[PDB]
Every structure is written in C-alpha cells, then in structure tokens.
C-alpha cells in the first residue's frame, strides 16, 4: 500500500433497521417479479370434466391393484410384462408425476414408479441433493439465527493482510464494503408466498 492514507477506515455499519422481514419481503417481491416474466402468462383456465380428489384416486388405484395381487406374478426385468404390471406402472407413474408436480417430494416411490430413462435417474439425483441442501441451509441459518451471526456468507479473509499486499486503499476499501454489506443482509426469501 503506497502512500499514507488521508483518513482511517471504519466499519460501514450505516443503517441498522433493514429488518429481516422487510428485506426478505423485498426479496420476495423480486422473486415473484422475475418468475412471472420468465414464465409469461398464467395458462388459460381449465374446467374439470369430473370431480375427484387425489386421495380418492389413490385409494381407488390401491383397491383396483389389491384384488389382483394373487394373480399378479413377478418376472425378470428383461422378460415381457403382464397386464397387471402394465396397469400398475401406468397408474403409479401418473400418480407420482402428479404428486411431484404438486410438491409431495417422496423420492423413494418417485425413483421407482417414474424412473425409466437414465435421464430420469439424473434428474432424481439432482432433485434429491437440492432438497437436502435447502433443508440443511434453512437449519443452518436457523442455527445461525439462534447464534446471532450475520446471515450473508463470510469469505475467509484476513483484511490486515489485504491492505499489505495491495498497492492502493481504494480497491481494498470497496471490497470491505461489499462483504460487510453482504454480511449485514440476509438472503432468505418468503416460502409460502412463493409456493402460492
């Protein structure tokens, strides 16, 4: 760092309000904003031809497949399938696709009744990690909130070293400002609102 500075450097802890609720709510406004433009228009409304609940459909499927259990016979994967097996596969595939679209991410059955292409296994693996990652992050940020630490991730840095190797204060100053401001803000977004 060439040239003794004209002033010292101090923490840029300017505004203290930035309540996580308001900042998160502002973050919720952005998330909904970008998604609507990406997706476009809400698709045209569709009227159901018949009325029935997903639970009722699942129960009916279970009843239908339960009476043929004795007749149903297993076979090798490469061998030709039976009528019962085909019906079960189709029904379960549709049911679990509907469930995954809805939000009931039960991976144990989705990987069985929906995976038929290695691409599908890839998608399931990617999805499975994503859900676990979000859960840990939410718990970590909840534990971080329990520990009262800045939500924004902290870069592992020793700023006394930064000024040393650097030739001027300006790039270092700004770098401190950005990370410091990042630490102050929390990167959480409203959950229920987005799912609506």
């Amino acid at each position: 760092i060439s040239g003794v500075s004209p002033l010292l450097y101090f923490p840029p802890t300017t505004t203290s309000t930035t309540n996580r609720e308001d900042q998160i709510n502002k973050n919720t406004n952005i998330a909904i904003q970008m998604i609507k433009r990406y997706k476009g228009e809400v698709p045209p409304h569709y009227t159901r031809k018949s009325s029935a609940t997903i639970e009722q459909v699942e129960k009916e499927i279970d009843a239908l497949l339960g009476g043929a259990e004795k007749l149903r016979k297993t076979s090798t994967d490469d061998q030709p399938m039976d009528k019962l097996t085909l019906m079960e596969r189709c029904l379960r595939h549709a049911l679990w696709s509907y469930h995954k679209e809805e939000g009931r991410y039960d991976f144990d059955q989705i990987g069985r009744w929906v995976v038929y292409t290695p691409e599908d296994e890839v998608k399931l693996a990617q999805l499975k990690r994503e859900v676990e990652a979000k859960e840990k992050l939410a718990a970590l940020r909840k534990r971080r909130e329990e520990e009262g630490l800045p939500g924004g991730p902290v870069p592992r840095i020793n700023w006394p070293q930064e000024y040393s190797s650097f030739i001027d204060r300006e790039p270092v100053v700004a770098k401190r400002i950005r990370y410091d401001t990042l630490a102050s803000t929390t990167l959480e977004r409203d959950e229920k609102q987005i799912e609506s």
């Binding site: 760092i1 060439s2 040239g3 003794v4 500075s5 004209p6 002033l7 010292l8 450097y9 101090f10 923490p11 802890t13 700023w159 006394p160 000024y163 030739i167 001027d168 204060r169 300006e170 100053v173 700004a174």
Partner: protein, 137 residues
Amino acid sequence: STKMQTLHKLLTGEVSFKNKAPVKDCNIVHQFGENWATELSAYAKTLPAEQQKIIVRQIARVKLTRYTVAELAAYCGDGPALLDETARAANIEQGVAFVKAKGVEAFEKYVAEESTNANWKPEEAKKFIEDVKAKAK
C-alpha cells in the same frame, strides 16, 4: 535530475506509467518516495513561472486524488478546501457511533488495528482516539 524531469512529465501527463496505471497519490509515492512533494517543489524553483504554477496546481490536484471517489463525492460536495475538515468530522462521527455501539476497549483495539492498516503514526492515532472520546462526553 532525471527523477525530477520524469516526475514533472508524469504530473503534466506527458508520460504515463508502464501499465498506464492511474496517476494517484498512491502511485506517485510508490515510485518517487514519501517526500516527493518537497523535492519537486524545490526543483520547480529552477523553472520559469508558468512551469512553477503548473507544478503547484498538479501537486494540489494529486493531493486531492489521495481520497477515494466515494469519499470525494460524499465529502467534497462543498469544495475541495473544505474537504479535509468535512472528512475528518465524518471520520470522527463514525468513531463515536462505534464507541457507543461496542464499548471502548474494543474500539481502542480496533483503532490500533486501523492505524496499523492505515500506515498512520502512533501520535495521530492517539490524537484521533482522544478526540473521539472527548466528543462522546
């Protein structure tokens, strides 16, 4: 002789650095020493009046360049001559807020760290820390 000639050309803008780096107070100190201003001023006296005026004007501008753009925008709004006092007051106000926020002993340690990071003299840091404490009460 060569050093003064190079410095005069650099300040005048005739010759830039090897990498075209900005001619800041930092870089000039980097290549021409801590007291480049004093030696340049003495050297300028051996030059006609027009060159002397240019040297003085360039030196003053370089000193103003010693601040960051954000600091100049925030503090130099009401002229450059009043920039130093406004910046010092703003710097002092930040110290008061920190003291009221996280005690004094931590502030004393922080001031020591910042003075170390700022290449500031122990006397200036002690003068600064005393002033902020007095301002508090």
